[PDB]
Ligand binder design. Structure first.
Ligand code: ADP
Ligand code: ADP
Ligand code: ADP
Ligand code: MG
Ligand code: MG
Ligand code: MG
Lengths: 73, 375, 375, 375
């Protein structure tokens, strides 16, 4: 589900990155993080700050313009 | 995230969210109190385009939104929308966690108490602040004035107060609340610009009318000779470029907007005006207070940035009050922010730290505790 | 046959079939949307000579055929002939089985809905595609422009749109549809070449007139002084060799063809012209959108390859729109193909794969499902 | 010519000129407010064929004209064309000299004042009437109702008002003006008939769409179950013979036209609808007026001849207003004429004869006198 969290052709991370590279919409990094917060935060092991869900908490040493992945490591 | 216990001063009076830290000069996050919603369908696949636009971001997209102020005349109407405003306030603009900071809200006197009570309920149950307080807007407007004695006129977007305070003691029987404020002046200005020929009907167009009100209005010290002057020549006609194209040119509408604030019969609202609610709030006070209310009349909230309104104010109260009185309309040019500034002062006092409505005292007596600790 | 699930982007706007695969730069199969039929008897025994000639093969034999465009003004007239065009499209030119590939059709807005519905019925019942979508031509013309905000002019062979889109949201009330397009300019050009002296009456001769329109026309930036210039000297007379013999020499007909597009009173069709349907589509939009429609006016479909049409377009909209506006007529030279290119982009997005009108969902609610899933 | 001093009641609200004498039941001259102009050349020598066709004569020749309403949303656009309409009104249809008769014009509230002022300037300088008055359309719609208390909905071709009046006193602060009216419903009906398959683009074809709207529309008391009913069976499909040939058959377009009037999100115009502008105009009034506004809600202008619109109106206001109120939607079947009828009553009162803006009082203070005598 980490692999599925990254590689899914509709809900993966690389599908969203291929989307943002594919369409031009004056795309930046924060808009890509906004898209990841929209569609990728419905999974348990994804973790971000602006979303809520995954996770609700305001955890310290979790900045903005970044995200956490709970890897096997 | 934050290595401090600095109190949060969050201030939505009725029409403009301003927030920041305790012990600070300028409010850090200033943005309008609007929530957006797309009133029609989306087409472009892969855009983001969430069904929420709050704050100035909504004003970036106000052409395609139905703008809706969640708080009206100081009364919160939609609690979910105000929760969006607070969520965007603490988590996006001010960018701090509410769990580690006490909060200092503001409201109007003569408020429906479910606003105060449910506001405390949302602040403790949802955002989980450790401490919370419900500050009066006008008293904080007297804190930023550096005085302990004075009658307070603030006149925000949805409310005006005229709260008299003498030597640390307020006069709760002489308090006032008139519902004529800047949003009603915006609607009346939209009506008389429709009378001139510029039709504004959209909420985004209403926001443009609010912009024309902020930029290009003054107070007309003598309304009769100013009205005959505007009827005389075109020295008062002023052009304002609208966004995207056609310019406007306003004449007598430049000063008939705040005259409605001094004369509510133009908007048909049965009242006495600002200058007579001040004089009635002074005459409801006792005899040996009034020259201290005359020398310290404060006019330091919103909707008072019209030029010369202190001259109309002093010039009218001088006609109302008896002679040999020194009518000092104190108008410090740091107003529209002074309620936040008084929030910063009062949140930074040493004595205030045992007046916080705190958790485990909220849970002790439920949400009614605000009506026995705060005021 | 094919080891992929690549979506098919089939695009007949009204006059030129272009088709190909998703995620590709150039459309693979480009051929004209004509069906041929021998209007007289055959004599040679043992020839083949079927009673159908579709695509460019019909233009190989256009001397002995009655050419007939099966789709007129974006409206499909003969469904059997369009089924021949699709059969030749997927099975002969593009050379792939429709059973294993999703398909991305295109149409006009303000379409008669039996075109959309029966088009979906033919795509599922006859060719048995697994998925299908009915794309708007102008929105795809904005996908290939790399923008999310702009008003779209495409002007294909039978239709023009001027669809305004702001920040991912289209404006369906400000949409337009004018039936003046390149085929009407071909008929008017045939009429004025009959006025000069070259009589064209056959549909094959009409195809030759379309060739002269494509090769040898420009837009006349100022039509009055260009008309006096063509009346003045022979610096505008240009010879074009017809197929098989006699050359022609056109003068003022070189620029009176697209002036009909900018002025429909020449063809007697009651309209306002292209430049005023753009300005009316902008004025139907709200106030805070228009400079984003001025800086991103897209002109990227067919019938815009006339030289200098962006100069006439910007030069006229500048006369219509108020001043201090930046009228940027975006004319990327990859047009006439950009609706297919936007088909390739939109068919290759990641978000699009749950917007496919698919089989077992088509069969669930019948052919009306397009009016609730697609738009 | 005329042996009387009978006042002229001329009434162009926005879309239909009706005129007549004071103290009369039916308006004498009723004709559409259009001016015609031949959009192409004439050929037959010796025809007459002037370059002006006004009133119903233009509808006799509407195939060869570009029809153009000179007044739009109650605002007069072309003063020369409206002068043609008035010249044809007094001199041809009504057939009386304006020099010997006072005139009673009508307009909308919240009008651009150059319409009122220049209208008075044309009435005195060109036609030389002895007296003149600028009547409000909705107040006259309450004069024909026989009441002195009620809120007025008229909804003409370009404007709707909802003017509340209590016991001879109007409430000018609670007044409303929505620009959604019958012409916008005609354009939306033209759009959705283009959606069905009947393409109407000419102004004469737009007039035919207006005819189909007048003949064959109703209001759909519950729009959801009526929409499911139209999607269910063909009991709502109705054929209407167009002029010269092909019949049409409308289904859900029969009732989606006035639902746009009750729901402006279909036409994308940001509003609240008719039923919420009535309720907002009642809630802007004071507390002790409202049951007299509930028992006397008048619905007596144009665009209300759709069957059952009083049932949708009462059925919706009952859902909005609090209970134990008697919502009486007064719909007298003499509407579409009641603004003229109130013109006939008010022009025939005894008290009115010192409220005429007259000549030698017009010349005393210029054209601004209307803003101090009339309202
Ligand atoms: N420079 C200005 N001139 C005139 N009016 C202003 C100006 N600045 C703000 N306003 C008005 O003041 C209102 C905001 O007042 P404020 O007291 O900040 O509201 P709040 O109650 O949210 O604190 C706005 O509605 C705005 O129209
Ligand atoms: N270089 C050109 N110059 C002028 N007209 C052209 C040119 N290329 C194509 N056209 C015209 O454009 C029309 C085809 O436009 P297009 O948008 O490709 O049609 P479709 O609607 O089938 O996509 C044809 O009628 C043709 O006459
Ligand atoms: N029987 C009818 N059914 C539906 N609509 C009608 C009917 N009669 C008139 N209308 C509409 O009412 C409009 C005219 O309203 P009216 O108030 O008479 O116009 P004016 O503002 O010129 O007085 C016309 O646009 C017409 O479409
Ligand atoms: Mg305030
Ligand atoms: Mg095309
Ligand atoms: Mg009317």
């Amino acid at each position: 589900i980490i692999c599925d969290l990254i590689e899914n052709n509709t809900n993966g991370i690389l599908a969203m990155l291929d989307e943002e590279c594919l369409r031009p919409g004056t795309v930046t990094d924060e808009t890509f993080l906004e898209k990841l917060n929209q569609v990728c935060a419905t999974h348990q092991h994804f973790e971000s700050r602006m979303s809520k869900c995954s996770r609700f908490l305001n955890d310290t040493t979790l900045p903005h313009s970044c995200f956490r992945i709970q890897h096997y490591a | 995230d934050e290595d401090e216990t600095t109190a949060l001063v969050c201030d939505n009076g009725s029409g403009l969210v301003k927030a920041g830290f305790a012990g600070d000069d300028a409010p850090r996050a200033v943005f309008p109190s609007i929530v957006g919603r797309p009133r029609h369908q989306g087409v472009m696949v892969g855009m983001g385009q969430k069904d929420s636009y709050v704050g100035d971001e909504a004003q970036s997209k106000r052409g395609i939104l139905t703008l809706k102020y969640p708080i009206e005349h100081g009364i919160i109407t939609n609690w979910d929308d105000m929760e969006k405003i607070w969520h965007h306030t603490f988590y996006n603009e001010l960018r701090v966690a509410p769990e580690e900071h006490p909060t200092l809200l503001t409201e109007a006197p003569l408020n429906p108490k479910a606003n105060r009570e449910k506001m405390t309920q949302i602040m403790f149950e949802t955002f989980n602040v450790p401490a919370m307080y419900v500050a009066i807007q006008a008293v904080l407007s007297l804190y930023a004035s550096g005085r302990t004695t004075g009658i307070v006129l603030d006149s925000g977007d949805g409310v005006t107060h005229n709260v008299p305070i003498y030597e640390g003691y307020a006069l709760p029987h002489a308090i006032m609340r008139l519902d004529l404020a800047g949003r009603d002046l915006t609607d009346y200005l939209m009506k008389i610009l429709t009378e001139r020929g510029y039709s504004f009907v959209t909420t985004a167009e209403r926001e443009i009318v609010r912009d024309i009100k902020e930029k290009l209005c003054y107070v007309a010290l003598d309304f009769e000779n100013e009205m005959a002057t505007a009827a005389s020549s075109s020295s008062l006609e002023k052009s304002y470029e609208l966004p995207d194209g056609q310019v406007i040119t306003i004449g007598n509408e430049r000063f008939r907007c705040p005259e409605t604030l001094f004369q509510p019969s133009f908007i048909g609202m049965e009242s006495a005006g600002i200058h007579e609610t001040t004089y009635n709030s002074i005459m409801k006070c006792d005899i040996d207070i009034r020259k201290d209310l005359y020398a310290n009349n404060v006019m330091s909230g919103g909707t008072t940035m019209y030029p010369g309104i202190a001259d109309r104010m002093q010039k009218e109260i001088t006609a109302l009050a008896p002679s040999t009185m020194k009518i000092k309309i104190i108008a410090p040019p740091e107003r529209k922010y002074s309620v936040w500034i008084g929030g910063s002062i009062l949140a930074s006092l040493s004595t205030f730290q045992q007046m916080w409505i705190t958790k485990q005292e909220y849970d002790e007596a439920g949400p009614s505790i605000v009506h026995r600790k705060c005021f």
